[PDB]
Amino acid sequence: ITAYSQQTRGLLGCIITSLTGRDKNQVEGEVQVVSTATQSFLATCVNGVCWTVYHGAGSKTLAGPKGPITQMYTNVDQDLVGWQAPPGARSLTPCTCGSSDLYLVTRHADVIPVRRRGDSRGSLLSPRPVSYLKGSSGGPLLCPSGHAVGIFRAAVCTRGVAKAVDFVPVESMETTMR
Amino acid sequence: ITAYSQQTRGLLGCIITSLTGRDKNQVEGEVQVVSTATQSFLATCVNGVCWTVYHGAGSKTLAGPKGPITQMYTNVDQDLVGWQAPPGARSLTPCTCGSSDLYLVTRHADVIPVRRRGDSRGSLLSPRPVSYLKGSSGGPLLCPSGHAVGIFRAAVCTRGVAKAVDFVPVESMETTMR
């Protein structure tokens, strides 16, 4: 599995687009890299809905082709918030098929192996500093097939380095949709 | 208790106000949400002084009406930092009541009940995931009456779950002010 980051905006673009709330550009790719005034993070489409983490987005709207999209889903207790996917988005399809071999994709585009160690638990093979996963909250955890198993919430770190990851599992996103 | 968020600047103003050091805006509320170039957290006014956490502010000045304000305090070992409260700045009054029934008001205006497990901790009755708390350190911890009993320092996590939190006691801020 591989990935390549692509920038589509800069300061003026975010500042104006965030004011008007209307983004004329077009969505493309499975995981978009979003940003607010204070923080930047990721958002991943799974089942035609832009899912992201509550801590980063809060209850803000997404800038869209016809104006600001209101959050369709909001599961605060699981730090989840999802917007109805805008046009051009190549949505991922769920998975969670017993596999314990996952791949975390970060916001600079690096696909790192995470061995599932639970439902929302997953140890890393290659430890990295907590500094290496900043801005990747809301990223997707991909099994080998290329199907989404969950949304990354934050690194499980021990005084210095990151050891494991905590994720909102795809299944939970499915139940929140109902 | 209840509370609500209110954005007062976007990226372009944080930027400009970060370099000129002068904040030409009316301060209101009691807990403000502040930012630096690589971070955003909270800061609250107890006893006429804007307290925040050291791991956020560090030793930087706070942009103010006549120019940047210099730190009045700096307990690096306690992770506490403070600035004299600029014009107005509503200030929460110290505790009194010793109620184990604490209240953590998160950076997104979310209020979550906390049970004081002692001098400097407070368990969460409803154990949220650790990431929910991101960007909320520095926030206040009240008791049913609306009194400040601490400053959110860090969530005491376990397997990515924020079972409880760590706060600087208001008594320790007071000791400092002595």
């Binding site: 589509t8 975010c14 709330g21 499975e30 | -």
Partner: peptide, 13 residues
């Protein structure tokens, strides 16, 4: 209020 804003994308392959 200010809106979140897609700033780029990560294209899987």
């Amino acid at each position: 209020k200010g809106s979140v804003v897609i700033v780029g994308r990560i294209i899987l392959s």
